[PDB]
Enzyme design. Sequence first.
Site, mmCIF file in Angstrom:
data_model
loop_
_atom_site.group_PDB
_atom_site.id
_atom_site.type_symbol
_atom_site.label_atom_id
_atom_site.label_comp_id
_atom_site.label_asym_id
_atom_site.label_seq_id
_atom_site.Cartn_x
_atom_site.Cartn_y
_atom_site.Cartn_z
ATOM 1 N N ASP A 210 29.510 40.838 41.560
ATOM 2 C CA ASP A 210 30.585 41.809 41.439
ATOM 3 C C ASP A 210 30.895 42.528 42.751
ATOM 4 O O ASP A 210 29.992 42.884 43.523
ATOM 5 C CB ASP A 210 30.186 42.853 40.386
ATOM 6 C CG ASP A 210 31.265 43.841 40.103
ATOM 7 O OD1 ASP A 210 32.350 43.452 39.566
ATOM 8 O OD2 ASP A 210 31.059 45.032 40.427
ATOM 9 N N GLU A 245 32.830 37.510 43.643
ATOM 10 C CA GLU A 245 34.127 38.149 43.457
ATOM 11 C C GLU A 245 34.434 38.944 44.721
ATOM 12 O O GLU A 245 34.014 40.105 44.848
ATOM 13 C CB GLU A 245 34.168 39.061 42.240
ATOM 14 C CG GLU A 245 35.548 39.638 41.996
ATOM 15 C CD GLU A 245 35.592 41.119 41.677
ATOM 16 O OE1 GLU A 245 34.546 41.803 41.711
ATOM 17 O OE2 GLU A 245 36.696 41.638 41.378
#
Length: 513
Positions: A210, A245
């Site tokens: 993330d 990401e």
Amino acid sequence: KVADPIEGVKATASTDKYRNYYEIFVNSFCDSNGDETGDLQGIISQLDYLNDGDPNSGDDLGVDAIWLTPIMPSKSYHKYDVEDYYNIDPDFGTLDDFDKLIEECHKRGINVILDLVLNHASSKNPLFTKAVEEVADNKLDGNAEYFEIHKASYFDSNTQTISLGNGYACEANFSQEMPEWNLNSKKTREEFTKIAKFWLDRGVDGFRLDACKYFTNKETDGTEFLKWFYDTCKGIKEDVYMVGENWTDDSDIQELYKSGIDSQFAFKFSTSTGTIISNIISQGGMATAKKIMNYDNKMAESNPNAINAMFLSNHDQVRSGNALESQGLSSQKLAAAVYMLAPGNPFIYYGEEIGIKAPNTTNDAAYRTQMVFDSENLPDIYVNGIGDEPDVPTGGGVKQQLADKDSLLNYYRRIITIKNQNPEIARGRIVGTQGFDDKTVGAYYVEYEDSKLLIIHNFSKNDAKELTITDDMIKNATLRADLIPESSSKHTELKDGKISVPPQSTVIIKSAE
Ligand SMILES: [Ca+2]
Ligand SMILES: [Ca+2]
Ligand SMILES: [Ca+2]
């Protein structure tokens, strides 16, 4: 009637890092105990839909890896604010439920990666609440050393922070509930090693990282941090896989690939404003083939083992069906073929394969609506700020779409089978494009271990294209596969060096063996 070219071609299940991934937003997928919240046993109950373990029979989707969104304890429904990095949120299950999920996925050839949130923790994580307490007593050499805590003057007017005692504050770009870790801290790196080992010891195949964009800041080189973390995890598990990401420009993605991370999401090609959907609307096939080649190869400069990660939309973006269904079901089908037949690991967002749409564009939760396995027996899952009964997808739920030979779902199934028959597609590099004197046709050569395939897309909505294949293109060329969206009973053929490619169709050419 023209024979289907993929009849009597054996399919093989992947045993390496190359996969057709399926992203599951856990709270919205499958409720197994009636509380209106999706959970891990609900996922387990649907594993035979995701992959039945046999690539040559059945009526499963056939995805062979899952990315779970955050599953650890958290007060929110999305759980990106992590309160405990060593357990399962009780609404999703127990660690025993998690271990059974891993066991049952691996039995079917499905790998599992977890959403790992290293940029920030929950403001209610006990490591952080202890730091808050110590800082209020002006103690900065304890738990404060885990977090991005500095005097307030350290931070720029535009950087959100969490105010602490004694003139201090903590970086907090996303939210007051998401204080950021200090990624240079020795204590933090020891803690991240313990977290990674905890989950890898449970059979986890890797991680989705993330918020990688926020790894880099004034004192932190995100590439250095990620190389440290990736190398640490590879010492634990040599074949660990990670996808980052990194929601940023192409140059910063290329730079972060120097870490050695396998993959980063290819944001450039996603959404209604991205390359694939834009060029399906413009009938720009040639442009698309050029861009896929140039992007995949450019990233491979920085990591020669890069596995690109194409996708149409994810849990942070409007559903791709909101743009594509209005263009026609054959446009939705072509979009699947284009992004999934590029090199690397494509990521299907749960429900994309049955055309789930977002009810609005003003609430992130609209991108996370309930999965519909049977439109005659709708689920009851509560979706934050939206409600607890989903809309029926235009083509029906999973059950209905499996029974309709012309469904969107069955086109996804056929793409996956074609890839299981042709390992070069995912694993190779694009060594060139092929022009057919027509901006509407996009074609390229993908080559893996001296085996070369020619992939051809006709982006025309209404016109078939008659193409000539020569020995200089593909020696002793044969039709290896077709994807023709107007009807599942329509197939084409390569005859006397000529092949008709119908509207919005894909063909794959291979040398005779
Ligand atoms: Ca439940
Ligand atoms: Ca099967
Ligand atoms: Ca940060």
